Paper text:
Brachyury is a transcription factor that plays an essential role in tumour growth of the rare bone cancer chordoma and is implicated in other solid tumours. Brachyury (encoded by the TBXT gene, also formerly known as T) is the founding member of the family and was first identified in 19275. The DNA binding domain forms an immunoglobulin-like fold and contacts DNA via an unusual insertion of an α-helix into the minor groove. All T-box proteins recognize a common consensus sequence named the T-box binding element (AGGTGTGAAA) with family member-specific variations found in the preferences for repeats, orientations (inverted or tandem), and spacing of such repeats.
We were able to crystallize the WT human brachyury DNA complex to 2.25 Å resolution using a construct spanning residues 41–224 with a 24-base pair DNA sequence. As for other T-box structures which have been obtained with near-identical DNA sequences, two copies of brachyury bind to the DNA in a 2-fold symmetrical arrangement with a small interface between subunits located towards the N-terminal end of the first β-sheet. The contact area between the two protein subunits is small (in the region of 200 Å2) and the contribution of this interface towards the possible cooperative binding on similarly spaced palindromic sites has been questioned following structures of related T-box binding proteins on the same DNA sequence which do not feature this interface. Unusually, compared to other transcription factor families which recognize sequences via major groove interactions, the final helix is inserted into the minor groove of the DNA with two conserved aromatic side chains F213 and F217 inserting deep into the groove and making contacts with the bases. As has been noted previously, only two direct hydrogen bonds are made between protein and nucleobases, R69 contacting the N7 of the guanine at position 5 of the motif, and the main chain carbonyl of F213 contacting the guanine at position 7 of the motif. The relatively high resolution of our DNA complex structures has allowed us to examine the DNA protein interface in detail including identification of water-mediated interactions. We note that a cluster of water molecules are found in this region in conserved positions when comparing our structure with the TBX3 DNA complex obtained at 1.7 Å resolution. The water network contacts the O4 of thymine at position 6, the guanine O6, and cytosine N4 at position 7. As has been found in previous T-box family DNA structures, the DNA contains some significant distortions from regular B-form geometry, most notably a widening of the minor groove to accommodate the insertion of α-4.
Author numbering:
A (entry chain B): 40 to 112, 119 to 220
B (entry chain A): 40 to 112, 119 to 225
DNA sequence: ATTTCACACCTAGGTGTGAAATT
DNA sequence: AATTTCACACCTAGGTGTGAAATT
């Protein structure tokens, strides 16, 4: 196939993956960091597509953080990228960033993807053809972006990188 | 026809309009206030459309504000609404607000609309069918939203209404409510 | 007469913190 | 004790008119 989906900023994602990544989930929705950003080529530049994001279990068991390490102890709803629907040229000319998806531990509203806390999840992206002869769906999972949903950060080394890179955490970037 | 396009918050618009509305233009682009919003019905909920905004000259005069009144003394580039392209159901389920369009006097390529200062303009919206059997471009002009592009507000009565309704001007609101 | 621009002051909201609540 | 919640200080990000200054 012509389609090519690449995870942008993989170096940054692997820095979090190494220490086991954590994404805060809140009742009101919490943005991800790092932000999932995808590079796409191979779409028809003049065809219409919608990008979808959901979250798949990365394993089967509940997780627990004890003594500085992670120990064992259903697919989410889908989020539509706010640029959808759009032509393939739009999706290809710049990386598709899911900067506005919010993760939550309660089904309290729309636009927020509910996650079960202390479980490992893998982001999965779907490219949906809009108005073609037939339905085209492609799935793309990125192992580098696996994480455990938490209500509070467990590994402080993750907290440090979150502070180091998320501009919204700049006030804590003193140390 | 089936299509129906009407202006949201027309009452607010006509408050500026009967004073002679004014829109600041800057080098880096200035958002409009009030924001142009339209209610759409009659579109095919499953067909694809884009919404386009441009500005047509409301007359041939240059304009001048002297002693508390206005006096005599080419269509713009088009702004594509950020929700474009989208299904008719998306356009119809809520007003189409052009809250992010920026008006400038120095066209420097940032997606902003260059206008001529001290000229009178009328927002004009275009609904364009996206990838149908054939073209469909409608146009809708809203006489209520006519305005004069300015580098600085001339009519303080207009400035007061900006301060009263634009929440980004809230810092000046209390002193304005104590006037007259 | 007209345009420019740094500025204070806002809207709007995204961070981790840490005390507290919940279990 | 493990986990969740929440008000908070502190930021990013950027939209206002003001009025002193600059430009014509
Ligand atoms: Na400009």
């Amino acid at each position: 196939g012509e389609l090519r989906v690449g995870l942008e900023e993989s170096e940054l994602w692997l820095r979090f993956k190494e220490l086991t990544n954590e994404m805060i989930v809140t009742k009101n929705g919490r943005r991800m960091f790092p932000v999932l950003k995808v590079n796409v080529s191979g779409l028809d530049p003049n065809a219409m597509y919608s990008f979808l994001l959901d979250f798949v279990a990365a394993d089967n068991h509940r997780w627990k953080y004890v003594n500085g390490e992670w120990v064992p102890g259903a697919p989410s709803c889908v989020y539509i990228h706010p640029d959808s629907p759009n032509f393939g040229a739009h999706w290809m000319k710049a990386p598709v960033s899911f900067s506005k998806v919010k993760l939550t531990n309660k089904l309290n509203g729309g636009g927020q993807i509910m996650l079960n806390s202390l479980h490992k999840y893998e982001p999965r992206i779907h490219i949906v053809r809009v108005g073609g002869p037939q339905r085209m769906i492609t799935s793309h999972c990125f192992p580098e972006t696996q994480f455990i949903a938490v209500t509070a950060y467990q590994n402080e080394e993750i907290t440090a990188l979150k502070i180091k890179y998320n501009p919204f955490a700049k006030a804590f970037l003193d140390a």
